[PDB]
Each structure stands twice: as structure tokens, then as C-alpha cells.
Amino acid sequence: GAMGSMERASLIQKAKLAEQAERYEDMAAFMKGAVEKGEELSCEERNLLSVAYKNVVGGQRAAWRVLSSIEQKSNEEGSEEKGPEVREYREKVETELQGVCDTVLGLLDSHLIKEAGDAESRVFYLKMKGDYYRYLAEVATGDDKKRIIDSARSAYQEAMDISKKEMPPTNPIRLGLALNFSVFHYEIANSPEEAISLAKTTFDEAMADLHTLSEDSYKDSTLIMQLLRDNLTLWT
Amino acid sequence: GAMGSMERASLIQKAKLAEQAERYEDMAAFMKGAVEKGEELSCEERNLLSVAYKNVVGGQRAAWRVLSSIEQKSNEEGSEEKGPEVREYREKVETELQGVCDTVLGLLDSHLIKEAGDAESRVFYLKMKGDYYRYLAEVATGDDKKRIIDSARSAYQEAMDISKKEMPPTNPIRLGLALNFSVFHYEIANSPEEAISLAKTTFDEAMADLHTLSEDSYKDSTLIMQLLRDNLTLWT
Amino acid sequence: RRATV
Amino acid sequence: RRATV
Ligand SMILES: C=CC(C)(C)OC[C@H]1O[C@H](O[C@@H]2C3=C([C@H](C)COC(C)=O)C[C@H](O)[C@]3(C)/C=C3/[C@@H](COC)CC[C@H]3[C@@H](C)[C@H]2O)[C@H](O)[C@@H](O)[C@@H]1O
Ligand SMILES: C=CC(C)(C)OC[C@H]1O[C@H](O[C@@H]2C3=C([C@H](C)COC(C)=O)C[C@H](O)[C@]3(C)/C=C3/[C@@H](COC)CC[C@H]3[C@@H](C)[C@H]2O)[C@H](O)[C@@H](O)[C@@H]1O
Ligand SMILES: [Mg+2]
Ligand SMILES: [Mg+2]
Ligand SMILES: [Mg+2]
Numbered sequence: 092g093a094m095g096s097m098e099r100a101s102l103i104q105k106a107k108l109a110e111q112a113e114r115y116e117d118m119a120a121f122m123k124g125a126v127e128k129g130e131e132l133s134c135e136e137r138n139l140l141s142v143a144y145k146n147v148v149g150g151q152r153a154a155w156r157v158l159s160s161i162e163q164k165s166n167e168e169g170s171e172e173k174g175p176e177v178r179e180y181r182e183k184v185e186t187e188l189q190g191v192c193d194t195v196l197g198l199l200d201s202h203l204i205k206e207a208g209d210a211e212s213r214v215f216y217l218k219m220k221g222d223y224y225r226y227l228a229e230v231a232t233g234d235d236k237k238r239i240i241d242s243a244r245s246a247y248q249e250a251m252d253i254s255k256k257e258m259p260p261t262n263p264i265r266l267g268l269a270l271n272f273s274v275f276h277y278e279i280a281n282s283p284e285e286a287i288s289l290a291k292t293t294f295d296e297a298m299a300d301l302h303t304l305s306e307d308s309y310k311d312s313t314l315i316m317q318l319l320r321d322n323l324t325l326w327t
Numbered sequence: 328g329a330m331g332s333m334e335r336a337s338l339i340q341k342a343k344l345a346e347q348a349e350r351y352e353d354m355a356a357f358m359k360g361a362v363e364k365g366e367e368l369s370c371e372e373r374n375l376l377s378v379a380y381k382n383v384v385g386g387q388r389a390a391w392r393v394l395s396s397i398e399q400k401s402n403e404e405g406s407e408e409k410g411p412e413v414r415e416y417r418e419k420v421e422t423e424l425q426g427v428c429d430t431v432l433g434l435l436d437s438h439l440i441k442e443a444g445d446a447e448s449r450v451f452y453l454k455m456k457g458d459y460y461r462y463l464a465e466v467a468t469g470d471d472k473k474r475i476i477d478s479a480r481s482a483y484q485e486a487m488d489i490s491k492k493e494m495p496p497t498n499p500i501r502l503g504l505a506l507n508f509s510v511f512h513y514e515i516a517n518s519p520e521e522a523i524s525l526a527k528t529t530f531d532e533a534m535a536d537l538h539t540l541s542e543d544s545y546k547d548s549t550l551i552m553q554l555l556r557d558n559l560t561l562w563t
Numbered sequence: 564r565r566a567t568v
Numbered sequence: 569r570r571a572t573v
């Protein structure tokens with residue numbers, strides 16, 4: 092790749108500069124180059140990878156939702172025919188988004204997941220795999236839609252099984268995994284009851300484990316707990 | 328170019344969709360394609376062109392300023408040597424920014440300016456030419472720096488001469504040109520007194536012409552007038 | 564809008 | 569920060 096000539100440490104340094112500059116596309120390219128050096132990522136490096144791509148795809152998804160809403164309104168009764176342009180441009184953004192998801196899933200499959208043996212790395216990468224299949228599911232409408240959804244489910248479920256066995260209920264990765272899998276249930280899998288049950292159980296078990304934590308860890312865990320509570324308030 | 332196969336009207340439609348989706352890079356590419364159809368732009372189309380590139384280069388410039396600040400701190404007494412990475416990444420962002428400026432200046436030179444005969448188009452394009460030379464001047468450090476600065480000055484000055492002869496003092500393009508040329512004087516040309524005098528004279532002459540305007544035009548002019556006042560408050 | 568992280 | 573438009 093275009094980052095093949097740059098030192099791993101320089102790629103990591105530049106990813107941190109890109110984060111400070113809010114240059115998330117650059118950040119993602121630097122972190123892809125770092126992954127492709129073939130060495131495992133540290134905890135801090137995993138966070139840089141996930142933040143870079145979360146922001147890139149987050150912008151693409153927000154744009155896709157704007158265009159999809161315009162497209163739906165254009166297909167309602169009484170709407171003037173405006174030609175193929177809205178569909179074409181929504182498709183353009185969609186294809187670019189799918190390309191980024193495929194890139195992330197490829198990094199996870201080659202070879203981040205197979206080399207990740209500690210719970211904190213394996214659950215992290217499997218959460219990412221569920222997230223990026225979920226983003227593919229948000230835009231899917233074809234023969235493969237159910238298989239994309241099941242790929243997201245399968246990755247989240249493996250991550251959940253490991254997280255419950257190997258991490259405390261307050262672990263931020265375990266909490267964030269549960270938050271996102273609950274959203275998957277609510278809005279992808281048409282399972283709002285499962286979404287609500289998962290969010291509630293995760294919140295309650297984390298509450299009961301807060302007493303073991305330092306002040307700094309307590310702050311870290313309660314932040315994601317508030318997101319679980321926010322979703323429960325929205326859904327109930 | 329890659330937009331050569333798309334209808335002019337479809338490029339304009341997609342630029343408007345890109346604006347709604349905050350996809351300014353796409354917006355700029357669509358509007359470059361529209362310009363390259365060779366027909367003059369309407370007032371609304373000129374605004375789409377300027378907004379697209381203003382947002383693209385605005386993000387690049389903000390990132391450049393972040394990285395430049397880090398680079399300066401790294402070159403102070405007592406700072407640990409962190410290698411070439413900060414300079415390299417600042418240079419990368421700088422080169423990309425310069426490329427966008429060169430693209431805009433090329434569109435203006437081929438052939439938007441030479442075909443623009445009405446004051447509202449000619450002043451608009453010359454303001455843009457001054458703006459994009461000014462952005463080149465913000466990052467310039469070489470033998471050509473003074474010539475870049477004088478290119479910005481020359482474009483702004485021609486726009487100013489036309490605007491004073493052909494537009495009312497409340498015209499938003501005339502006001503925005505004056506705002507930016509005043510900033511050029513303040514922070515590029517080391518002429519704060521000229522910057523302040525231009526902002527004050529422009530504001531006072533616009534105030535005296537507000538009485539001729541409809542409610543809608545009054546709102547449009549007073550908005551940029553407040554920016555002139557904001558700068559005067561900052562500078563005095 | 565619902566939260567993910 | 570000073571304003572341009
Ligand atoms: C780009 C890296 C920088 C900015 C330096 O760090 C980002 C954040 O990384 C840390 O948190 C992580 C973190 C976030 C926290 C909720 C941020 O709220 C704090 C102050 O906890 C949001 C980020 O998307 C990230 C990296 C992602 C995830 C998900 C990743 O699923 C694959 C699982 C939950 C959570 C975990 C990993 C959090 O542990 C620090 O703890 C924060 O301080 C810091 O801001
Ligand atoms: C992308 C296009 C959309 C979003 C549809 O329209 C953008 C805006 O275009 C209009 O204003 C222009 C305008 C702005 C106004 C200050 C926006 O504040 C209003 C409500 O006046 C900021 C934009 O950078 C733009 C296009 C640029 C310029 C500079 C261009 O120098 C080459 C000169 C001054 C000013 C003029 C041209 C303004 O006339 C409308 O009047 C607004 O309503 C509308 O928001
Ligand atoms: Mg090496
Ligand atoms: Mg498609
Ligand atoms: Mg029920």
C-alpha cells in the first residue's frame with residue numbers, strides 16, 4: 092500500500108496528529124498502514140484505529156441518511172419526477188461507504204482477529220466486525236441482506252460470549268459492545284424487546300460492579316452506562 | 328474530467344444535494360464539472376461553486392493551522408526532538424491545500440473571469456481569485472511569497488474598483504469583498520491601519536445606504552456588516 | 564438519536 | 569477569530 096514505505100512508529104505518530112487535526116480520512120489511512128505492518132496493536136493503537144474509521148464511516152452514513160430521506164420523499168404520491176440524480180448520488184455515497192466497511196472488515200480478517208488472544212483485543216475486534224457488518228446492513232436491500240445481518244449478529248455474539256466470561260461487567264469495551272448489539276437488535280434485527288432487555292441487564296450488572304473501581308475507572312464505565320440509560324429512555 | 332459525461336443540470340442538482348448532505352468535496356467536484364461545461368454560471372450557481380471550495384479549503388486550512396502550531400512548539404527551546412513526522416504531515420496537508428487553491432484559480436482563469444462582464448459576476452470571481460491567492464499566501468515561505476501576496480492584492484484591488492463604480496455600498500458581494508480585503512491587509516500585508524480604515528469606511532457607507540433597501544435586502548446586507556463590526560471590535 | 568459507541 | 573466570508 093501507499094504506507095508501505097513509512098515506519099510503523101511514524102504511522103502511529105501521524106495518526107495521532109491527524110486525530111488532533113480532525114483529519115479522520117488521513118488518520119484511517121495511517122492506521123491501515125500500521126495494521127498492515129503485521130504486528131499486533133496495543134490498546135492505544137486499537138483505539139486510534141477504531142476512532143479513525145468510526146468517524147469516516149459516521150460521516151458517510153449521515154450523508155447517506157440525508158440522501159435516502161430525499162429519495163424517499165421523491166418517491167411519494169404527488170412528488171414531481173426529478174430524474175435519476177438523487178438515486179445516483181445516494182448510490183455513489185453508498186458504494187463509497189461499503190468500500191470503507193469492506194476495508195475495515197478486511198483488516199480485521201487479515202489478520203487482526205486471528206492473532207488476538209487476550210479478551211481486550213479479541214472482543215474489541217469482534218465488536219468492530221459486528222459494527223461494520225451492521226453498517227453494511229443499514230444500506231443492504233438485496234439477496235445477501237439476511238446474510239449480512241447474520242454476520243453482524245455472529246460477530247457480536249462471539250464478542251458477547253467472550254466478554255461475559257473474561258471481562259468485568261464495568262469494562263468499557265464490554266459496555267460499548269452491549270450498547271451497540273442492543274442497537275443492532277432494536278433497529279436491524281426487528282427485536283426491540285431483546286434490545287431493551289440487553290440494555291437493562293447490562294446497565295444493572297455494571298451498577299453492581301462499580302464499587303470495585305478506582306475513581307478513574309468509575310468515570311470511564313459510568314460514561315457508557317449513561318448511553319445505555321439514554322437508549323432505554325428513548326425506547327421506553 | 329470525471330464529470331465530462333454528466334449533464335450540466337445534473338451536476339448542479341447533485342451539487343445542491345451534496346450541500347444538503349455536507350459533502351463539500353463532492354459538491355466542489357460537481358461544480359468544477361459544471362464550470363468545465365464552458366457556459367457562464369448564474370448567480371445561484373456561483374454561490375454553489377464558492378461555498379463548495381470555501382468549505383473544502385476551510386477544513387484544510389484549519390488542519391494546517393493545528394499542525395503548524397504543533398510544529399512551532401516542537402522547534403522551541405527545550406522541546407524533545409520527535410523526528411520529521413510533524414513537518415512531513417504539515418507538508419502533506421499544505422500540498423493538498425495548495426492543489427485545491429490551484430484548481431480554483433485555474434477554473435477562474437479558464438475561463439470564468441474572462442467571460443464575466445456583469446459587475447455581480449466579475450467582482451465575485453475576482454474576490455475568489457484574491458481569496459485563493461490569500462490562502463496560498465498563508466502557507467507560503469519561499470522566493471514567490473511576495474508575488475503570491477501581490478497576486479491576491481491585485482485581484483482584490485480590481486474587484487474593489489469595479490464594486491465601487493458598479494454596485495451599491497450595501498451589495499453583499501461588495502461588502503464581503505471589503506471584509507476579506509481588510510483581513511488581507513491586517514494579517515497578510517502587515518497593514519493593520521489599512522485594514523481598519525477599509526472596514527470602517529465600508530461599514531459607514533453601507534449604513535448610509537440601508538434606507539433604499541427592502542426588508543429582505545436589508546437583512547442580507549446587515550449580516551455582513553456585523554462581520555465588519557466584529558473585526559473592528561477585535562482589532563480596536 | 565439513539566447512541567452507539 | 570476574525571471573520572472572512
Ligand atoms: C483516538 C483516540 C483518543 C482520542 C486518544 O482516545 C479516544 C478515547 O479512547 C478511550 O475510550 C474508548 C473509546 C471511547 C470512550 C467512550 C470515550 O470516553 C471516555 C472518556 O472514556 C469512544 C471511542 O470511540 C473509544 C476509542 C471506543 C470504544 C469502543 C470501541 O469498540 C471497538 C468500545 C467502547 C469504547 C472504549 C474502547 C473506550 O475505552 C479513552 O478511555 C478516552 O479517554 C479517549 O477519549
Ligand atoms: C451553497 C449555497 C446556498 C447554501 C444555497 O446559499 C448560500 C448562501 O448564498 C447567499 O449569500 C451569499 C453568501 C453568504 C451569505 C453571507 C450567507 O448569509 C445570508 C443569509 O445572506 C455566505 C456564502 O459563503 C455566500 C455564498 C458567499 C458570499 C461571498 C462570495 O465571495 C465570492 C461574498 C459575500 C457572500 C454573498 C455572495 C452572499 O449573497 C444567500 O443570500 C444565502 O441565503 C445563502 O445561505
Ligand atoms: Mg521498520
Ligand atoms: Mg447499491
Ligand atoms: Mg414487551
Ligand SMILES: [Mg+2]
Pocket residue numbers: 334335
Ligand atoms: Mg448537455
Ligand SMILES: [Mg+2]
Pocket residue numbers: 418421422
Ligand atoms: Mg510546502
Ligand SMILES: [Mg+2]
Pocket residue numbers: 520
Ligand atoms: Mg494608527
